[PDB]
Every structure is written in C-alpha cells, then in structure tokens.
Design a protein around this ligand. Sequence first.
Ligand SMILES: *[C@@H]1O[C@H](CO)[C@@H](O)[C@H](O)[C@H]1NC(C)=O
Ligand SMILES: *[C@@H]1O[C@H](CO)[C@@H](O)[C@H](O)[C@H]1NC(C)=O
Lengths: 50, 49, 28
Amino acid sequence: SISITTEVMPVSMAKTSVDCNMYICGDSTECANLLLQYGSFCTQLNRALS
Amino acid sequence: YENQKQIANQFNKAISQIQESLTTTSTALGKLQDVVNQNAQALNTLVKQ
Amino acid sequence: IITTDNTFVSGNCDVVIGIINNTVYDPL
Ligand SMILES: *[C@@H]1O[C@H](CO)[C@@H](O)[C@H](O)[C@H]1NC(C)=O
Ligand SMILES: *[C@@H]1O[C@H](CO)[C@@H](O)[C@H](O)[C@H]1NC(C)=O
C-alpha cells in the first residue's frame, strides 16, 4: 500500500521589541535621571531582543 | 581510469582557487569572528558596569 | 578465478595507466 503521512515542524516565532524607557518610566524626566544611575541595562536588553 | 589526468587537473585548479578566494579579503570566516566579538562585547560590559 | 561473469569490458589497452596482461577464462 501507498501511505501519505503528515509531519508538522515549527520554524520561527514572533519578533518582539520593547522600549525600555517607555516600559519603566513612561514620560517622566525624574525617572529617566534615576534610571541613568544603573549604567547600561536598557541597551543590553535591546541588543539581546534584536 | 580513462579520464584520470583531467580529473587530477580539475582537482588541482579547485585547490588553487580556494587559496585565492581565501586571500582576496572575503568574509567567509565571519562565523568565527562573531564568536570572538561576542565574548569581547560581553566582557567589556562587565567592566563598564 | 577471473572470468567473464565477474568482469566487464571497456575500451582498448591504450589509455589506462597500469594495465597488465592476463587471460580471462570463458565457460564456452
Ligand atoms: C607505479 O610507480 C612506478 C614507479 O614510477 C611506475 O613505473 C608505475 O607505472 C606506477 N604504476 C601506476 C599504476 O601508476
Ligand atoms: C602485453 O602484450 C602486448 C602484446 O601485444 C605487449 O605489446 C605489451 O607490452 C604487453 N604488456 C606489458 C606490460 O609488457
């Protein structure tokens, strides 16, 4: 007999990004100056997601 | 067995072409470069923090 | 034993490098 069989494989997922200042601080100027004290944490997570 | 000289000549020319493509400044070894870069990048971050 | 059953024929004895002289038995 001749049989035909299905196999389903995932290839990719969704490409997502976050604005680190918009998530953490929103539109605040005080929060941005307080977040500057942590060094480079937003750049590193943006680089990983990219 | 009847085409041995031609096959040897083609083998020799392909070997010669590899060491020219690996001389004319290609970026075929970028997979080995990226790894190096990644290490440096991560470690540089640990210093600046 | 080298016979015609386990051997095949191709061309003349002029282009292969290293060919020798030997007999090939045939079962007639
Ligand atoms: C093997 O090497 C010898 C020595 O040069 C040479 O006379 C002979 O023809 C060679 N045989 C083959 C099959 O290349
Ligand atoms: C095989 O026999 C032929 C006879 O026609 C001869 O010319 C040839 O030299 C022989 N082969 C060798 C390797 O001597």
